[PDB]
């Protein structure tokens, strides 16, 4: 009824410990969601074309051209680690767990409140808020996954991360097909390159409507909506990282000399002349058996063209890479292609007392050593005469195509049947949790945005919309906008996310890396004297595991 | 209760496939309906007489004289194709099906909201909207078809075609009896032709009221009304067209000289002199057996007097024709009598963002070839002397009654026992779906407005009305209009229309016509940058079928 | 999820576009470029890569001689202009048993190039490589364009 509650607030985390070292992590998240009525009740096909920014030669990477359908519906997205776990929960998980499974997900909407706003004619403005007990909130769950998948973590538009702060749903939109061409250039290119928006291919048009595709529930103040429990079918996610590159695979060489006194410069020596050694190499025209030249089982990682931009029907885009840079852990300034950079607002980690439109940003440097250090690569002639001469070697300091700033490693790909690589680590709190698999016939081996990828399906998207609240002057044949009472809704959202994790075992004599509080990061986890909060980022794959 | 929803919004279309190539098409439509309190609570008997327009000689076809009963009720009519199908569903139906059956219809009203309007006495006007929880909406279902049948598609007054656009019902009115005489004339006619409204014949007076004939349900904010499933008894509707005229029935003549080379002018020849041929003709006094004179089983189509106006007690009206014109499919400018013209507004297809009172119009050119090419006909004397002389042939070029613009084909009827014709095709989105059969002893073979005609009876009309909300100063003895609290209602209408259709089969080597999205019509099916929408007319009988 | 448009058009026409509104270095989102603040449609992270670039009209040799390197996807812009159909678009040559007009004389086969509706190809004239630093606007020495020998 009007005065009866339809649900309970729960933002607790439960750790039920099953048999055989497994734990059943249940994460409950409850939010107060504020929803305003849409700016228009209509679907808009809008086209963006920043020809002013791209008309500057050399700015082709700043292209924003696209077409999208703008919908009156809003999306309630909880696909971010911060919606479920606070820093203590994350510390427990990443310090005590070895692997993580995604089990089930359910959500519900309860305690719906719809209000109206009326402004007086008094010369000094004043306005009052009234309940509309008969107003309804439209709710649609796309359980069949008919609508385009639009995960909000990409735009930092999921639900907030604080149980005690109200949150909002992101207005919903999806990409409408367009054709675009942009010929790249540089500062000093003669003429204006081709920079044209071509229009839309009729064979690719897809105008989706929530009304025509999803059942819609009308909720009054006494109604509730529950989705039911969806069960995932994803692969396990590892909370451990690999440090072994190809140089650390297999039996090391026997040291026929070992140091007799401890010290930095007291090295051990193999003691066998290099071309007189025993072992296996994949180089049939040399007798040198060295650490660089000895055969290894396979490859760990792969070189890829970095900051390579590829063009298709819709315009340029960056070629994605599955691993981060080498040497970035030692020097953060060297973090580059492959190290994901997140920008976010005050709902999602930025100090809440800060003023200004500038977001908080961090580049996520992962602990796994699967990257490449391109400054250390080189090609050389098949003859393999050592020491190598200038004409028989290609170094990263060597111009490709006549350019002093482009070398061979920029256009270099070594992905092959021998490549081994890991899935992307989880990123707390701004990282996406699960992603839908592409509907291509042949599927990618991994996703760069989520550690969990859904094979068959995973949960439909939850859309909300304040139902139209018309005045007495409505005329559907009028060309002007709809006359509506200023109406908005506040409703409570509760979700349950279930994980299954495996407790870790100490395999080594030494202790491992763990997340801890210290004097430096002490005040990143508590409120300020004026109530400000922040959620800094945390690394996930702390513990090391042996690759081979 | 006040805060509990009484129904769910559903506007999906389901295609459940059955055995033997039959599909159970379930179309769901849900609207938000805006209803105002009527201008008056009283029934009116109103006479319209545009003597000014018909006083000009030659304007008799512009007669608008009639008498109607203006009721305070409003009609919730969903009897148009666009209320149930969007362009994609229509494409699927018309491209993959051969015949359509109308099965069942049901509708329900839920989530009733009644609001009142109050205007402040402040010098700058302002007004507020309040909920009247005790107010009622009067709902009447005429399940016994006691009231006159007044389908709204004929006036373009059905529910809107867009699920996301609130719609309105049409104020209900029905014809009263009147006697009218209007003697036709032309510019230059001497004197004033008789143009007189005669009154009402008492033997034909029929004054229907909803209250004395139909149960009325008083719905408060927490109430819902459901009609119950109705089941039709109509004939199947064909989604194929016939191209065979009389000239294309039977066995073509044997060609004794087949062409020896490709080309447009490389024709074949029968090779037998026309007066020495074998076959059957109904011309017992001539030896010529020619394609025009050879016997055929029956007649496909018929000639009717076109732009003929017939006068009965109530005044002139156009004589309808079951088939369209000939040659109109090659030249749209030749579309005339028989090709329906639909004039509609922004609720029913006209681009919603356009201003002005001008309606959107289209003339439907059916794919069927059952029409006539009146300028290709002629009549000649029974003797059949060829080549025919002037005095023995009546041509469309020749005058009738001394008129240079009227020829014998204007007064010509060739309907007979040998006439074969087709039913009217569905017209999307603006066409009627079903119509009621006339209560005459002898009934028409087809209706020219709806492909489905209801043999016994079919669903009762749904009437809605805001119950009077009186002030404290009501006095039934006063002659002035009742003083009411300005009240309007918004309620949700959901309807389910079920069809049965048969999947088509390929019977020919060549492919057939299909409706498709192309670069020309691409933007008729997607919204504009400011939300504009339109629904364009689509043909229905795309595939051909052999008549004989 | 496309970017939220803070400015929407108020009239219909070819010059009425929508605007994101947020300055490019002030935007929120995820990029795979740890050394820049620019979140743009060409730089924002995507789940994976649709299609791939392959060496086109590449001939490789083995024991039996040279053969073309096959490719799984067609070209970009082939649908827009059929004269651009190239590597990746299968070209079929056939005679009068298998489709060629049967009444035509001569030994010339009937041919067509198949342009698929799937958009998984590439527009190599639109690709470019630029130095990791990513200083914009890019200068000549720090970009490798398809126009470069």
């Amino acid at each position, epitope marked *: 009824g009007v005065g009866i509650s339809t649900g309970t607030f729960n933002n607790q985390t439960e750790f039920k410990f099953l048999e055989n070292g497994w734990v059943y992590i249940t994460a409950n998240s409850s939010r107060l969601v504020h929803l305003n009525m849409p700016e228009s009740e209509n679907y808009r096909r809008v*086209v963006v*074309n920043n*020809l*002013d920014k791209t*008309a500057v030669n050399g700015n082709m990477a700043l292209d924003d051209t696209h077409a999208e359908i703008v919908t009156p519906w809003s999306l309630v997205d909880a696909n971010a680690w911060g919606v479920w776990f606070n820093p203590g929960d994350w510390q427990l998980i990443v310090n005590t767990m070895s692997e993580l499974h995604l089990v089930s997900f359910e959500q519900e909407i309860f305690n719906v409140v719809l209000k109206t706003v009326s402004e007086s004619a008094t010369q000094p403005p004043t306005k009052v808020y009234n309940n509309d007990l008969t107003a309804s909130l439209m709710v649609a769950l796309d359980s069949n996954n008919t609508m385009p998948f639009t995960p909000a973590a990409m735009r930092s538009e999921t639900l907030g991360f604080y149980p005690w702060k109200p949150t909002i749903p992101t207005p919903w939109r999806y990409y409408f097909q367009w*054709d675009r061409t942009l*010929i790249p250039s540089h500062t000093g290119t*003669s*003429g*204006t*390159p*081709t*920079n*044209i*928006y*071509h*229009g*839309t291919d009729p064979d690719d048009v897809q105008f989706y409507t929530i009304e025509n595709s999803v059942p819609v529930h009308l909720l009054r103040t006494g109604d509730e909506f529950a989705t039911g429990t969806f069960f995932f079918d994803c692969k396990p996610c590892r909370l451990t990282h690999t440090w072994q590159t190809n140089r650390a695979l297999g039996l090391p060489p026997f040291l026929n000399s070992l140091p007799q006194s401890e010290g930095g410069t007291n090295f051990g020596y193999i003691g066998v002349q290099q071309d007189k050694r025993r072992g296996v190499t994949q180089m049939g025209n040399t007798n040198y058996i060295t650490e660089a030249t000895i055969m290894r089982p396979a490859e760990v990682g792969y070189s890829a063209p970095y900051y390579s931009f590829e063009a298709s029907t819709q315009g340029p885009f960056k070629t994605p890479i599955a691993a981060g840079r080498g040497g970035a852990q030692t020097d953060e300034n060297q973090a580059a292609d492959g190290d994901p950079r997140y920008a976010f607002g005050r709902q999602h980690g930025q100090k809440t007392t800060t003023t200004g439109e500038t977001p908080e940003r961090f580049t996520y440097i992962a602990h796994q050593d699967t990257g490449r250090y391109p400054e250390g690569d080189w090609i050389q002639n098949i003859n393999f005469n050592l020491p190598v001469t200038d004409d028989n070697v290609l170094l990263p300091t060597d111009p490709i195509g006549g350019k002093t700033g482009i070398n061979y490693t920029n256009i270099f790909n070594t992905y092959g049947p021998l490549t081994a690589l890991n899935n992307v680590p989880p990123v707390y709190p701004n990282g996406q949790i699960w992603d839908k698999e592409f509907d291509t016939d042949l599927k990618p081996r991994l996703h760069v945005n989520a550690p969990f990828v859904c094979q068959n399906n995973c949960p439909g998207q939850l859309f909300v919309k304040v139902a139209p609240n018309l005045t007495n002057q409505y005329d559907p044949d009028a060309s002007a906008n709809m006359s509506r009472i200023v109406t908005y809704s506040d409703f409570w959202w509760k979700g349950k996310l279930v994980f299954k994790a495996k407790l870790r075992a100490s395999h080594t004599w030494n202790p491992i890396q763990q997340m801890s509080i210290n004097v430096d990061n002490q005040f990143n986890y508590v409120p300020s004297n004026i109530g400000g909060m922040k959620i800094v980022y945390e690394k996930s794959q702390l513990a090391p595991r042996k690759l081979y | 209760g006040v805060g509990i929803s009484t129904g769910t919004f559903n506007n999906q279309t389901e295609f459940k496939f059955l055995e033997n190539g039959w599909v159970y098409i379930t179309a769901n439509s849900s609207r938000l309906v805006h209803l105002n309190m009527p201008e008056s609570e009283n029934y009116r008997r109103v006479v319209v007489n545009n003597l000014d327009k018909t006083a000009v000689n030659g304007n008799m076809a512009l007669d608008d004289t009639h008498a109607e009963i203006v009721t305070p009720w409003s009609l919730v009519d969903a009897n148009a194709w666009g209320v149930w199908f969007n362009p994609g569903d229509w494409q699927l139906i018309v491209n993959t099906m051969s015949e359509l059956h109308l099965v069942s219809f049901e509708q329900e009203i839920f989530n009733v909201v009644l609001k009142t309007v109050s205007e402040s006495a402040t010098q700058p006007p302002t007004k507020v909207y309040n909920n009247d929880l005790t107010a009622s909406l009067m709902v009447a279902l005429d399940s016994n078809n006691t009231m006159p049948f007044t389908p709204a598609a004929m006036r373009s007054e059905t529910l809107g075609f867009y699920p996301w656009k609130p719609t309105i019902p049409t104020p209900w009115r029905y014809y009263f009896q009147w006697d009218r005489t209007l003697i036709p004339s032309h510019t230059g006619t001497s004197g004033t032709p008789t143009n007189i409204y005669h009154g009402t014949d008492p033997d034909d007076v029929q004054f229907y009221t909803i209250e004395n004939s139909v149960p009325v349900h008083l719905l408060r904010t927490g109430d819902e009304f459901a009609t119950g499933t109705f089941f039709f008894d109509c004939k199947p509707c064909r989604l194929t067209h016939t191209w065979q005229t009389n000239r294309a029935l039977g066995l073509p003549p044997f060609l004794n000289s087949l062409p020896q080379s490709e080309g447009g002018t490389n024709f074949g020849y029968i090779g037998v002199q026309q007066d020495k041929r074998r076959g059957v003709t109904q011309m017992g006094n001539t030896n010529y057996i020619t394609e025009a004179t050879i016997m055929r089983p029956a007649e496909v189509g018929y000639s009717a007097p076109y732009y003929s106006f017939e006068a009965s007690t109530q005044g002139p009206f156009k004589t309808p024709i079951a088939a369209g014109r000939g040659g109109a499919q090659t030249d749209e400018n030749q579309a005339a009598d028989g090709d329906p013209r639909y004039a509609f507004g922004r609720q029913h297809g006209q681009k919603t963002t356009t201003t002005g009172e001008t309606p959107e119009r289209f003339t439907y050119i059916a794919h069927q070839d059952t029409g006539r090419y009146p300028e290709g006909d002629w009549i000649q004397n029974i003797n059949f002397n060829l080549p025919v002389t002037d005095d023995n042939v009546l041509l469309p070029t020749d005058p009738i009654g001394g008129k240079t613009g009227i020829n014998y084909t204007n007064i010509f009827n060739t309907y007979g026992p040998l006439t074969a014709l087709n039913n009217v095709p569905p017209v999307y989105p603006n066409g009627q779906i079903w119509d009621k059969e006339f209560d005459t002893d002898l009934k028409p073979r087809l209706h020219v407005n709806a492909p489905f005609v209801c043999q016994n009876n079919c669903p009762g009309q749904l009437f809605v009305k805001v119950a009077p909300n009186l002030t404290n100063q009501y006095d039934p003895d006063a002659s002035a209009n009742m003083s009411r609290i300005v009240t309007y209602s918004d309620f949700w209408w959901k309807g389910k229309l079920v069809f049965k259709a048969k999947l088509r089969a390929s019977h020919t080597w060549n492919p057939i016509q299909q409706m498709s999205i*192309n*670069v*020309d019509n*691409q*933007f008729n099916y997607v919204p504009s*940058n400011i939300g504009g929408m339109k629904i364009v007319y689509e043909k229905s009988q795309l595939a051909p079928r052999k008549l004989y | 999820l496309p970017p939220f448009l803070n400015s929407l058009p108020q009239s*219909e*026409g*070819g*010059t009425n*576009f929508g605007y994101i509104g947020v300055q490019q270095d002030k935007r929120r989102g995820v990029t795979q470029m740890g050394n820049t603040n620019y979140i743009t449609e060409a730089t924002i992270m995507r789940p994976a890569e649709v299609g791939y670039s392959a060496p086109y009209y590449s001939f490789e040799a083995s024991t039996q001689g040279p053969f073309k390197t096959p490719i799984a996807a067609g070209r970009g812009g082939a649908q*827009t*202009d*059929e004269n651009q159909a190239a590597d990746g678009d299968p070209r079929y040559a056939f005679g009068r048993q298998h489709g060629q007009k049967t009444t035509t004389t001569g030994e010339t086969p009937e041919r067509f190039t198949y342009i698929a509706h799937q958009d998984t190809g590439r527009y190599p004239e639109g690709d470019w490589i630029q130095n990791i630093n990513f200083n914009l606007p890019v200068t000549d020495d720090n970009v490798l364009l398809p126009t470069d020998p």
Partner: antibody, heavy 126, light 109 residues
Framework: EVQLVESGGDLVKPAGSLRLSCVASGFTFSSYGMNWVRQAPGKGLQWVAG???????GYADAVKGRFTISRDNAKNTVYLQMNSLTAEDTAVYYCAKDRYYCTGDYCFNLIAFGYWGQGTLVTVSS | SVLTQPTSVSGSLGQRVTISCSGSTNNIGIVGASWYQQLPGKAPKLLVY???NRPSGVPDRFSGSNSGNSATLTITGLQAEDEADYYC???????????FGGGTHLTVL
């Protein structure tokens, strides 16, 4: 090779109306826009109007309130309708094709005529 | 919006010729000019695109460049084939209006 042919030239009164037509061939007609450019005697080229695949049109400020342009992709034909003509409209009108593929509402951001017809003469006088 | 061109330009056989077209940030500063050739009484012919490319069969003699709000057409190795009239064409994206220049007559000495 691409080829265009125009027609419709005539002499009309200082306040009449006229209609012109071009026929095209040799390319994907629906993919490229077609434009009307005129040249007064002894003067330079002047743009009149252009129409794209979906029927969207653009008119110069000199003719925006008077003229109308249309297509028929099933017939590879482009028409121009002129109303309320004045003496200044006298010129030879040339029918041309765009180098760039644009179809819908958002054209006229990059135009470059790559093929041309033969031209037709329009004379406005008493 | 209108573009500006010099009335005439003169060059001698074998020399270099330059023709200049001036516009604004609204027309040439976003979409560069495209250059056309017109023999007396004949239909125009496109010479150089806005990006410096030429239609198939146009000699490399013809070249173009864009700087700020001004564009230029350069004809190298002037031959007797080049005596004609030349025009600059640009489109205004703000208004959606195609803009031609006034035209320049080329004299070969």
């Amino acid at each position: 090779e691409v080829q265009l042919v125009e027609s419709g030239g005539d002499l009309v009164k200082p306040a009449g109306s006229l209609r012109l037509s071009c026929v095209a061939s040799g390319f994907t007609f629906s993919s490229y826009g077609m434009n009307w450019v005129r040249q007064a005697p002894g003067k330079g080229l002047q743009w009149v109007a252009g129409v794209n695949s979906g029927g969207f049109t653009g008119y110069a400020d000199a003719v925006k309130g008077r003229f109308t342009i249309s297509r028929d992709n099933a017939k590879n034909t482009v028409y121009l309708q002129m109303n309320s003509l004045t003496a200044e409209d006298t010129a030879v009108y040339y029918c041309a094709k765009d180098r760039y593929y644009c179809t819908g509402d958002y054209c006229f951001n990059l135009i470059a005529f790559g093929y041309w017809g033969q031209g037709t003469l329009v004379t406005v006088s008493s | 919006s209108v573009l500006t061109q010099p009335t005439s330009v003169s060059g001698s056989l074998g020399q270099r010729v330059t023709i200049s077209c001036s516009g604004s940030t609204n027309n040439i500063g976003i979409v560069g000019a495209s250059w056309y050739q017109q023999l007396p009484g004949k239909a125009p012919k496109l010479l150089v695109y806005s990006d410096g490319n030429r239609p198939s069969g146009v000699p490399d003699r013809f070249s173009g460049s864009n700087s700020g709000n001004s564009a230029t057409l350069t004809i190298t190795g002037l031959q007797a084939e080049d005596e004609a009239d030349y025009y600059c064409q640009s489109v205004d994206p703000t208004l959606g209006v195609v803009v031609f220049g006034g035209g320049t007559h080329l004299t070969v000495l």
